[PDB]
Design an enzyme around this catalytic site. Structure first.
Site, PDB file in Angstrom:
ATOM      1  N   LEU A  91       0.852  -1.184   0.000  1.00 62.24           N
ATOM      2  CA  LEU A  91       0.000   0.000   0.000  1.00 62.24           C
ATOM      3  C   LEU A  91       0.896   1.245   0.000  1.00 62.24           C
ATOM      4  O   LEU A  91       1.662   1.591   0.921  1.00 62.24           O
ATOM      5  CB  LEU A  91      -1.017  -0.039   1.114  1.00 62.24           C
ATOM      6  CG  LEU A  91      -2.096  -1.091   1.153  1.00 62.24           C
ATOM      7  CD1 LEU A  91      -2.845  -1.075   2.498  1.00 62.24           C
ATOM      8  CD2 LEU A  91      -3.117  -0.744   0.055  1.00 62.24           C
ATOM      9  N   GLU A 114      -7.429   4.534   8.537  1.00 62.59           N
ATOM     10  CA  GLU A 114      -8.042   3.807   7.413  1.00 62.59           C
ATOM     11  C   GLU A 114      -7.940   2.310   7.821  1.00 62.59           C
ATOM     12  O   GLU A 114      -8.979   1.613   7.736  1.00 62.59           O
ATOM     13  CB  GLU A 114      -7.534   4.086   6.021  1.00 62.59           C
ATOM     14  CG  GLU A 114      -8.532   3.774   4.887  1.00 62.59           C
ATOM     15  CD  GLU A 114      -8.836   2.309   4.649  1.00 62.59           C
ATOM     16  OE1 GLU A 114      -7.849   1.537   4.731  1.00 62.59           O
ATOM     17  OE2 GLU A 114     -10.045   2.078   4.402  1.00 62.59           O
TER      18      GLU A 114
END
Ligand SMILES: NC(=O)c1ccc[n+]([C@@H]2O[C@H](COP(=O)([O-])OP(=O)(O)OC[C@H]3O[C@@H](n4cnc5c(N)ncnc54)[C@H](OP(=O)(O)O)[C@@H]3O)[C@@H](O)[C@H]2O)c1
Ligand SMILES: COc1ccc(OC)c(CN(C)c2ccc3nc(N)nc(N)c3c2)c1
Length: 206
Positions: A25, A32
């Site tokens: 990521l 998140e």
């Protein structure tokens, strides 16, 4: 035994549908990650000592979670791999396809199980996401929209938020989102470390 339950896809993507870069990521969104954990973990209190959710993931996504955050806790983990040679895990299930995983959970957790299944979530990556998109039980997408064009090399396979799909996928009211997730969630944009992002829920009629 194969499918009775609906499937829920959960993703964090940029407005360009980018979902990752170099098997990780390309962003660091700690809140998140906490929303993910919460959503994928939540089970109604009445059902809290018997039930659990399931997280279905591709073998590359499995290889992506810090060794420290493997397996996802309080959830049943299933890794999809053809090349199931030897998946290491003290009760981490392996299944060769999406439907192969559904019948294994349906087999491994029925009436005779002290452990019942609540919700089923597809948590990635792109290849598994393509297969869920085509599955007739997929009717909900939990999306985190990131308002930055972050260089990515893997993209979400269907442009669900685009005009071509607007008679199929519809965004639900924020009160509808918090009710499904059973808790209250941040409305509007969240900024954390230079990224502006927001939480959405999209649904389709089967
Ligand atoms: N932004 C987000 O929310 C989010 C969520 C998850 C992942 N990601 C990112 O997505 C990227 C990984 O995506 P990816 O597409 O490369 O990997 P992926 O779907 O996680 O893994 C692909 C592997 O999974 C198995 N697999 C997946 N779909 C399958 C099917 N339909 N039938 C059989 N096997 C299937 C195969 O395992 P074998 O080849 O072993 O058979 C295939 O090589 C990483 O960059 C990760 O960081 C982002
Ligand atoms: C402790 O857990 C992790 C820590 C680091 C990490 O990155 C490499 C991941 C990868 N991973 C499964 C992840 C992360 C964020 C997500 N957000 C949303 N909305 N949907 C997802 N499917 C999702 C999936 C997991």
């Amino acid at each position: 035994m194969n499918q009775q339950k609906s499937l829920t896809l959960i993703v964090a993507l940029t407005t360009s549908y980018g979902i990752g870069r170099s098997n990780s990521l390309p962003w660091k969104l700690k809140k998140e990650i906490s929303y993910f954990k919460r959503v994928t973990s939540f089970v109604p209190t009445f059902d809290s000592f018997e039930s659990m959710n399931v997280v279905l993931m591709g073998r590359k996504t499995w290889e992506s979670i810090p060794l420290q955050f493997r397996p996802l806790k309080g959830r049943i983990n299933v890794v999809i791999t053809r090349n199931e040679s030897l998946d290491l895990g003290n009760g981490i299930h392996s299944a060769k396809s999406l439907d192969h995983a559904l019948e294994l959970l349906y087999r491994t957790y029925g009436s005779e199980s002290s452990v019942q299944i609540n919700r089923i979530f597809v948590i990635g990556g792109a290849q598994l996401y393509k297969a869920a998109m085509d599955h007739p039980k997929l009717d909900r997408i939990m999306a985190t929209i990131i308002y930055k064009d972050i260089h990515c090399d893997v993209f979400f396979p269907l442009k669900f938020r685009d005009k071509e799909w607007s008679s199929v996928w519809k965004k639900e009211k924020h009160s509808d989102l918090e009710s499904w997730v059973g808790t209250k969630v941040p409305h509007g944009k969240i900024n954390e470390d230079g990224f502006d992002y927001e939480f959405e829920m999209w649904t389709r009629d089967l």
